[PDB]
Amino acid sequence: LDNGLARTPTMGWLHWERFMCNLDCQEEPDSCISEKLFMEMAELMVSEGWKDAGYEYLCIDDCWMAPQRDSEGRLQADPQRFPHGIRQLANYVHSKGLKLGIYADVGNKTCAGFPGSFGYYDIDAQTFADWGVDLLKFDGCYCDSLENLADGYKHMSLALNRTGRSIVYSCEWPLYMWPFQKPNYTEIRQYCNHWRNFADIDDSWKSIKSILDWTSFNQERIVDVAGPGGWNDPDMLVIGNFGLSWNQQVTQMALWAIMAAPLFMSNDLRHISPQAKALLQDKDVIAINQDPLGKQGYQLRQGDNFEVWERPLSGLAWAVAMINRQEIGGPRSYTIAVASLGKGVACNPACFITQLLPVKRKLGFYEWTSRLRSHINPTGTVLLQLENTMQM
Amino acid sequence: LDNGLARTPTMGWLHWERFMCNLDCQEEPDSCISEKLFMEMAELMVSEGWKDAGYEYLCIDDCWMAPQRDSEGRLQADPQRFPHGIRQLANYVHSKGLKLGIYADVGNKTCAGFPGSFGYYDIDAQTFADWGVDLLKFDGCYCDSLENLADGYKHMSLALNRTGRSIVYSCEWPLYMWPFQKPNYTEIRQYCNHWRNFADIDDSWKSIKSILDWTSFNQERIVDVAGPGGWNDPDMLVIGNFGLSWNQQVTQMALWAIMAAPLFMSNDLRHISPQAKALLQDKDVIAINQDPLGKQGYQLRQGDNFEVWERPLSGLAWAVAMINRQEIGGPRSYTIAVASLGKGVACNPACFITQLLPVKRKLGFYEWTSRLRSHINPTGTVLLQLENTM
Ligand SMILES: *[C@@H]1O[C@H](CO)[C@@H](O[C@@H]2O[C@H](CO)[C@@H](O[C@@H]3O[C@H](CO)[C@@H](O)[C@H](O[C@H]4O[C@H](CO)[C@@H](O)[C@H](O)[C@@H]4O)[C@@H]3O)[C@H](O)[C@H]2NC(C)=O)[C@H](O)[C@H]1NC(C)=O
Ligand SMILES: *[C@@H]1O[C@H](CO)[C@@H](O[C@@H]2O[C@H](CO)[C@@H](O)[C@H](O)[C@H]2NC(C)=O)[C@H](O)[C@H]1NC(C)=O
Ligand SMILES: *[C@@H]1O[C@H](CO)[C@@H](O[C@@H]2O[C@H](CO)[C@@H](O)[C@H](O)[C@H]2NC(C)=O)[C@H](O)[C@H]1NC(C)=O
Ligand SMILES: *[C@@H]1O[C@H](CO)[C@@H](O)[C@H](O)[C@H]1NC(C)=O
Ligand SMILES: *[C@@H]1O[C@H](CO)[C@@H](O)[C@H](O)[C@H]1NC(C)=O
Ligand SMILES: *[C@@H]1O[C@H](CO)[C@@H](O)[C@H](O)[C@H]1NC(C)=O
Ligand SMILES: NC[C@H]1N[C@H](CO)[C@H](O)[C@@H]1O
Ligand SMILES: NC[C@H]1N[C@H](CO)[C@H](O)[C@@H]1O
């Protein structure tokens, strides 16, 4: 989408994975979808260094609207859970130096059953623009056919442009194209800033395995289309919750950096361990994800329960991730010819290698003929930056 | 097994899950199956409070033997990886105040392909006794028929008794009896101190889920036979390794306590976090697991992606575990009528409830009419002790 936005993968916070559609504000006040939740989350994004690290977009997922539209036929926020309205929430978020994302659906209803946008694309686009929305996640539930789906997505894109406001457009279009047909990713990139490809993520290592395996299996279809202005979305970051071990959290961070993925945290910033905060705020790994070249990485090797991924970076630098998929035993040894890395350019004539995950450690100079030796934890990942150099 | 042993579930350390069959002592001297590894683990079991917590048995799994038997036809440890022999290793372990477990197989070969004990049951039993072995894990690979399997397990049991040495006898008989026929668990308890029921564990929440589900699905068959001298073995504790989140480790600890399971750590005691060390050395949870009454807990309730297990304890006390099996969202609320717990006697007329996991916290007094409300983390478990007001 050529709207000047998402020149690097969008960074922020989305409530869906962690808070879901909790409507019971009387019995579960701390987890229900309310304006107080988003206000407190914005406060913590500022105070706890999340904005400094790059997380800019505070995003509302499903279950923010009233059961029906107002008298004029416009979307209205829920009266009890959002008394002061989306405009006042956007004002608050902007006053903290952040940006506000909102949710809508292309069909007649949202996935949770709230008013859909079909028939009101222009009305809803102008409503979001007036409220001060900076990002729109557009879902695909309750849609008849591919004609309706495609037309709705393209229509909402053009309507948002016609509002004249800069609004990041996050689509779920490709994901909703199966079981009908394989998406034309060029068409989708034409209209979307990023697009969800695969099923929703949950708080489990199984889910990350599934997302990564699907991505590596379909990488010839989706890697080259990604770039500044249009990204593949493998869904939210679940670091800081309950289902991932430390090494699995490291794996998700490293490979979301490799995949040039939008970094949308879905956690409770009020209850997050120092470990997970440091991982999610890792300056070097975020720098990899935010590389100005904007070239998505890919799976280089796969076998012996090992995976090797790499991502090209600006200035002849490369990121390399090595995953141990063996879920038994201990740290497993892996060696690779340094010339096999970075298409043979990362370490020609030499490269300086810096391990970034699980710990940061300078590994030294590697000649084009040398071999890299590493040990990877079960379900863990070793992330490295290779800086091309002529010294040595 | 009425040999006076395993009156509480056996506690110790087994190398299999974490170290497997690592024979590459040239490239990984510190991780290969060698007497140096077991010496380091014994040293740390003393130094780091593991013996104090109750972990007593330092056990050797497969891949300790030489490729073949000696002149006399006896088992021998690997010459290079175990230079000083099992007897001297046992002497060292005993000098540290610990006990030594060894591994053998009922069939023609061990699962890794090393000398089996079929045909040598008496010889091998007497050899282990001479060496000073205090525990035998008996595997079931490379076995012709169910008859050979059963006969071998009973034979080795009786041979160990005839050596005159107190040796804890750990069997894998039930695991190798399915899917051919259902094991007679009374028969097995007659010959074994504990017995492996289900597939091997690995460093994954999936493995723990499968073990728990199998146990609850077959609980009508296996719960009542367990007791002092004979326990169900859901395989090793993998807390402290790589595949489990904190809450999944909490779940494993709590429900291995509920299940009156042998507590066999399989980890690297040289590199273990303070968190996992504190969980594995939890005094109250170990006390639950080591409850002298020896009544195995069971799944009381299952539904809404929630699980409720409970175990009767000594002195009219009860342990209650609540699992959240929903792997998405956040801490989920669960409420239960306190009268529904402990067969309806735990809190009649009242009970004091103490949460032990994930954190220790006094919850106060609960009348027989009260409801217990809790929030359980996804894939996590809340463990509670109920003390009746008497
Ligand atoms: C509505 O849609 C139209 C297109 O249908 C869209 O117009 C496009 O806007 C982008 C972004 O402003 C334009 O790209 C810029 O072009 C100018 C002129 O050449 C350059 O100065 C810009 O370069 C800077 O920014 C780039 C990042 O985009 C960097 O790569 C560069 O190094 C500079 O820093 C940039 O190339 C584009 O030309 C137009 N296209 C058309 C056909 O008009 C408009 O922005 C949309 N509006 C809304 C509100 O959505
Ligand atoms: C061999 O088996 C006998 C018979 O089961 C064991 O004898 C029992 O030992 C316990 C020890 O506390 C006593 O409480 C039982 O009363 C004994 N039963 C009988 C019938 O004698 C004996 O312990 C076993 N010995 C070894 C070395 O395993
Ligand atoms: C399981 O095996 C046990 C013994 O191995 C069986 O119990 C024995 O049954 C015989 C039958 O005459 C009695 O004489 C013995 O006294 C019993 N021994 C014990 C220790 O109970 C038992 O019946 C078998 N179970 C099933 C279901 O067949
Ligand atoms: C919404 O419902 C109307 C009335 O049944 C139908 O004509 C229309 O196609 C629906 N919209 C979508 C996007 O399916
Ligand atoms: C994809 O869509 C674009 C624009 O809609 C079009 O130019 C292109 O031919 C399409 N590709 C395929 C393979 O249909
Ligand atoms: C071991 O092998 C021999 C020869 O093949 C066979 O007769 C015997 O039954 C086997 N024993 C077991 C326990 O498999
Ligand atoms: N893919 C289905 C989508 N619908 C949910 C909101 O109802 C989440 O936004 C999810 O991303
Ligand atoms: N059930 C299979 C058994 N065989 C392995 C040793 O080779 C482990 O002891 C495992 O417990």
Numbering used by the authors:
A (entry chain B): 32 to 423
B (entry chain A): 32 to 421
From the paper:
α-Galactosidase A (α-Gal A, EC 3.2.1.22) is a lysosomal glycosidase that hydrolyzes the terminal α-linked galactoside present on macromolecules such as globotriaosylceramide (Gb3).1,2 Mutations in the α-galactosidase A gene (GLA) are found in patients with Fabry disease (FD), one of the most common lysosomal storage diseases (LSDs), which is characterized by the progressive accumulation of Gb3 in cells. To unravel the binding mechanism of iminosugars with α-Gal A, N-methylated derivatives 20–24 were synthesized, and we determined the crystal structures of α-Gal A in complex with compounds 4 and 5 at pH 7.2 and 4.5, respectively, and 8, 20, 21, 23, and 24 at pH 7.2 at 1.97 to 2.61 Å resolution.2,32 The structures revealed that these pyrrolidines bind to the catalytic site nearly in the center of the TIM-barrel domain of the enzyme. The bindings are primarily stabilized not only by hydrogen bonds (H-bonds) between the hydroxyl groups of the compounds and the residues D92, D93, L168, D170, E203, R227, and D231 of α-Gal A but also by a salt bridge between the endocyclic amino group (endo-N) of the monobasic compounds (pKa ∼ 7.0) and D170 of the enzyme at pH 7.2.
